Design a protein around this ligand. Structure first.
Ligand SMILES: Nc1ncnc2c1ncn2[C@@H]1O[C@H](COP(=O)(O)OP(=O)(O)OP(=O)(O)O)[C@@H](O)[C@H]1O
Ligand SMILES: Nc1ncnc2c1ncn2[C@@H]1O[C@H](COP(=O)(O)OP(=O)(O)OP(=O)(O)O)[C@@H](O)[C@H]1O
Ligand SMILES: [Mg+2]
Ligand SMILES: [Mg+2]
Lengths: 483, 52, 523
């Protein structure tokens, strides 16, 4: 093939101006002679503005830029599963090249009106605060929003670990293949996280697209799109995908950097005017396709870190108007030991109840209702003024449901062992058990109840009238602590 | 020669999808400035654009 | 376009000569016939390319250094600040109305100098060193650069000798060491100049009592002030006698903005003569927040990229390379010192503003002066809760350090319960004693303008309030009860408190006895 050259005119502030390259496409992946890739961003009348996927230190004026002939692509396919790649799909885990893979564009238009269908099948995260209150279907976009260190990743991590455990027990046609996109994080904490997914076995189904804090800002800008193209492989071939863009807060800061270094006029909090379209273009690709397109699905979990509980920030409110639901993780509940620190009053799932477990749909209806009154009572009974002994009843009942929704880290629960535990606490079987014992008490409930109740509930998907007759019997025969 | 009117729609030849431009400005040296109704990724600086 | 097509035009490609051989024989008559329509081309000279708002872009000047004094043909001086590829951007020390497009600029070959030495002492110079007091040129003086690099880590020693302001609120609570940078920050009309004046006047009262090497030679830099305000300061320093040791560098408000920018550096070079020669200096940059506005004006007119509040990016570097020249040199460099007092004017107390934040980071503590304490009768209005001296942990008078540590605690307990018990109706027997002692301690610290006190006499007035001896005068007599103690006490305890430096236990017992035969005006 004839190679089209181009000189670098001027490099610096992360963008090279490139003379030549007369037939280069807009958005084309160009390659510098130092090996570093670039994206032809602004085709001008006399140069090409190239954003540089890496360090701009290795580029000089007069370097040769070659065009690759194609728009910016990453390798997608089954050879990406198990592999830790950077923001351009190149593997950084030292396990050789990505074989068994095929390159595809990172910037694909999301499927239209006629290509979707309604989100029906559930996606279980294994978090019983989530899977009972904020239920998540396949094809949904669920924002995990909270402050710093409020368990934002803990919710994303246990969702990925739970999909490994579900994948061993289901047919191949309904198996969720996870992608974790780590943008702007510390290369330390991605290395702890790859070890965690390796020793659990979750890296059999997980791709890890890491653009850390030392990477260039166009690489952090691109890694959500590189990760979404890798997960759109499973969406388009009839399979199911999960994606976690951890800190879309940090993608937009990397994109704000490229806009201000391109001398573009800034808006709210110095953000570009198209910082909405940055996340809008990305999160619309998490769809549930129709039966004529395969029926595949991609579920997104964007993560947004707020500052002081300010959900009315610019990037925060941008994604709240993009995503379907919202998992708001609160810092006051987090320091009180309530973990996962779910703000039950604010956390919602738009699609939600149309796509949850029909056992949990008929148990957690009275869970979110009684937790509503416990929020209502302990917003007005803060003072310790007086007691109705029914408001003090729901104060002691709502304190039991809160401990019932506490959960440890890296131990997701199956949905059948979840809905029995909510059945055990809403139907009064966990009455008079002290609130410092319910972590131990429904560890006793799940362990002492016959395993056949979990298997009948898993296969029927619903608490049949023959089952709640039998499940109430098997909860009467439970050695609760303290009695 | 014979620049299109402002707000008039143009068509790009040989794109991946139908790319419709809409003339926003007359830049001044026989150049119009257009807004694309679809993506411009894959546009080359020689591509023939026809005026509707 | 490109370069590879344009680098091949240095080679001749003409291959025909009906133009090159003709007009070369016809160029020099056409050029010479408009010889009087020409100006001679400048290479090492400069020609004024454009001028306006005190900024002259200058074509030529091929050999100017950055920061060099250039001179226009009007006699007005300049300063080559940004040397660019086509022109020199100079700032004009004076009026640019006498500068025209096409004027000749001459480099002087000198980075900006000022007269420093023993002959500049007692004179009022402008922001560039030239005397404006109208008594001839400076004699017995020598030139020195205004952009001296500050002394390093290894040419400094620890700040241990106390520099006395003469203000009880300063010398007890926020004590100043001899080579220290202390900010005097606060709003307008809160007494920031009056703190700095009293520190200068007190040096004159101390210079006649110390053996010639402990003498402090003050420099007052007035930046962006009125000329009538500096005429009052000259009258106040002359009628006191303080301008035997005082220099006044005055760049007033009608002066050019490069002169107001350059006046803190010009005064510091005059003050560094005393630091470098083993003497001790003291410099007050009054309105350092008016230097930074002058440097912002030159930067935005020189088209430098603005930052927040449109200040240049090097406005921290402006104040840090000025204020780090205030040092306490080691004993191998003579042991001299220079202590700075920059004055920042805030706007409604907002010390999170950009220049106030920068100078708070540079200096070794602030003197805050609130305007609510000012009208509450506390003058000097030193806010104790916010004014810090981060050197003052054992950098003061040892006799005052006996009693200022208890004053720092007994006023601190008062500040929590002051805004608590604004009422005096229903009070505990423990918190009311803090409110009676803390109101006794507040009234003792305030003092009148232009009367700085010796340190041995404000030690005994804090000792008269830290101890008993004043728990019976109401609040309205402690101003009179303190000067009762200064009048009535045998003044030979001042001679042995000041000479020893601390309250010896023999003097401690006579101090209790002398503070009992006083006639307090509580009656
Ligand atoms: N359910 C849980 N139970 C107990 N500890 C938890 C739980 N979830 C998270 N944690 C702990 O809380 C801490 C913060 O959680 P996490 O790392 O998810 O925070 P984050 O929101 O990602 O914060 P960062 O800004 O540091 O990324 C960690 O020590 C983690 O182990
Ligand atoms: N200790 C004091 N006792 C009585 N009056 C004082 C005292 N200090 C200052 N004043 C009076 O308060 C007024 C303001 O003082 P000063 O000029 O020192 O403040 P400033 O901070 O320099 O104000 P500006 O910066 O606006 O000039 C002066 O007129 C002065 O007379
Ligand atoms: Mg995290
Ligand atoms: Mg003043």
């Amino acid at each position: 093939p004839v190679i089209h050259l181009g000189r670098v005119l001027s490099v610096g502030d992360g963008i090279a101006r490139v003379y030549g390259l007369k037939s280069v496409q807009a958005g084309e992946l160009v390659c510098f002679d130092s090996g570093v890739k670039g994206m032809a961003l602004n085709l001008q009348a006399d140069h090409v503005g190239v954003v540089v996927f890496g360090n701009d230190s290795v580029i000089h004026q007069g370097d040769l830029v070659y065009r690759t002939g194609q728009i910016v692509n990453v390798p997608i396919g089954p050879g990406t599963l198990g592999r830790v790649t950077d923001g351009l799909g190149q593997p950084i885990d030292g396990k050789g090249p990505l074989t068994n893979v095929r390159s595809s564009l990172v910037e694909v238009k999301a499927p239209g009106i006629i290509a979707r269908q309604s989100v029906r099948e559930p996606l279980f995260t294994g978090v019983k605060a989530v899977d009972a209150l904020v239920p998540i279907g396949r094809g949904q976009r669920e924002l995990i929003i909270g402050d710093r260190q409020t368990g934002k990743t803990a919710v994303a991590i246990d969702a990925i670990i739970h999909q490994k455990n579900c994948n061993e027990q289901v047919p191949k046609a309904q198996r969720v293949y996870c992608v974790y996109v780590a943008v702007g994080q510390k290369r330390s904490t991605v290395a702890q996280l790859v070890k965690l997914f390796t020793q659990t076995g979750a890296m059999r189904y997980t791709i890890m697209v890491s653009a850390t804090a030392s990477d260039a800002a166009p690489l952090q800008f691109l890694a959500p799109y590189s990760g979404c193209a890798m997960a759109e492989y499973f969406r388009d071939t009839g399979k199911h995908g999960l994606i976690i863009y951890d800190d879309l807060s940090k993608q937009s800061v990397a994109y704000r950097q490229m806009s201000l270094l391109l001398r573009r006029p800034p808006g709210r909090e110095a953000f570009p005017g198209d910082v909405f379209y940055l996340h809008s273009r990305l999160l619309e690709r998490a769809a549930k396709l129709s039966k004529e397109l395969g029926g595949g699905s991609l579920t997104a979990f964007p993560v947004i870190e707020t500052q002081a509980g300010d959900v009315s920030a610019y990037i925060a409110t941008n994604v709240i108007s993009i995503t379907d639901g919202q998992i708001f993780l609160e810092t006051e509940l987090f320091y009180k030991g309530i973990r996962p620190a779910l703000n039950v009053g604010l956390s919602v799932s738009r699609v939600g109840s149309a796509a949850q477990f029909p056992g949990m749909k008929q148990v957690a209806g009275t869970l979110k209702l009684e937790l509503a009154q416990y929020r209502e009572v302990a917003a007005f009974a803060q003072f310790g003024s007086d007691l109705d002994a029914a408001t003090q009843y729901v104060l002691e009942r709502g304190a039991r449901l809160t401990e019932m929704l506490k959960q440890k880290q890296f131990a997701p629960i199956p949905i059948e062992r979840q809905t029995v535990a909510v059945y055990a606490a809403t139907k009064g079987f966990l009455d008079k058990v002290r609130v410092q014992d319910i972590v131990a008490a429904e560890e006793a409930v799940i362990s002492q109840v016959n395993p056949a109740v979990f298997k009948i509930l898993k296969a029927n998907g619903k608490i049949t009238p023959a089952l709640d007759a039998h499940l109430k019997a098997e909860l009467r025969k439970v050695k609760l602590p303290g009695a | 020669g014979e620049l299109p009117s402002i707000l008039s729609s143009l068509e790009v030849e040989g794109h991946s999808v139908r790319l419709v431009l809409e003339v926003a400005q007359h830049m001044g040296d026989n150049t119009v400035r257009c807004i694309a109704m679809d993506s411009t990724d894959g546009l080359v600086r020689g591509q023939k654009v026809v005026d509707t």
